[PDB]
């Protein structure tokens, strides 16, 4: 009957992506649902970054490019679907921008005001896990750490492993500082994917049943 | 010792001409920089193919462009002791965005990373005279100058009168709070520039 916005926040390797997908799989059995990812930038993002590919951009300009691109995604896809009664699940939401931008020196209060045009999630799940554990999982999966996951732009002198630990650690600190103000539902990401999802569904089930 | 001088006014007010003329003159005395974006037009063009471009996104596109030029050119130059002149500063955005429905207070917060000019000249003139000039010179009114997105269907000329009128209302309400130096744009280019040079000189000739 009413649209609902569910957000997932967590570091790379925390498993929040899997949890968002698992929740979509369950919700779609009964209701219309749309799953998106913060990382899924659109056309404005591409036009500006390509146009300025030869120039060195500042954290502030990147913050604005991302907000600009999101403002379009928001009005074009997200908000319309919510108004239509869709349940929207976002694998990483505006809080990821809060973290990525503030860790790079952009004023936190300014970034919050910048994104004030966007509605807050009905529920935000923070899949919390130590960067050390997240790293172990990535190592065991045999895949390599991406420069972005290692915050290579900030820590080019560190190995991908050390960069990951330092950078994801800073992202974790931002999320931790946002928990109380943003009413994050903190989930112990060290638990099994199944136990985590069960907890999530209990929270979401209660939410939807009381949604009318 | 860096001084930021901004020029504001409607299209056809001569703000751009006055800004450049001032730069050419200050260049004879001190280090000075005149602020001078393709991709924006490419976004608007692509947006038309996508049937949507909200005032909010439009506001952010320009703020993004401004942030780049501010942090890579304006701010560094001011820190190099340069006098920086801009024919378009944050107030241009205040008007452009607020007439399209964007909360001006949010726009003020958006651009709060930028310092306020040491001097802001507001070349004020009625849209009627600005238009009369524009078409006294054989120039064509472009879509942006006519507020085509706000007043679609109107001839560029008719849209110009209405759009620039709305823009003027915003500049007028910023005068007191932003300490705008209001100039009668009906004066000749020479009269205006000579008065501007005398004013700026009285301020920087005894500091340099
Ligand atoms: Cl992360
Ligand atoms: Cl990240």
From Swiss-Prot, chain B:
Gene3D superfamilies: P-loop containing nucleotide triphosphate hydrolases. ATP binds at residues 9-16. It comes from Sulfurisphaera tokodaii (strain DSM 16993 / JCM 10545 / NBRC 100140 / 7) (Sulfolobus tokodaii). It comes from the Archaea. This is Probable thymidylate kinase. The keyword ATP-binding applies. One of its GO terms (cellular component) is cytoplasm. Belongs to the thymidylate kinase family. It catalyses: dTMP + ATP = dTDP + ADP. One of its GO terms (biological process) is dTTP biosynthetic process. Keywords: ATP-binding, Kinase, Nucleotide biosynthesis, Nucleotide-binding, Transferase. Its EC number is 2.7.4.9. SUPFAM superfamilies: P-loop containing nucleoside triphosphate hydrolases. One of its GO terms (molecular function) is ATP binding.
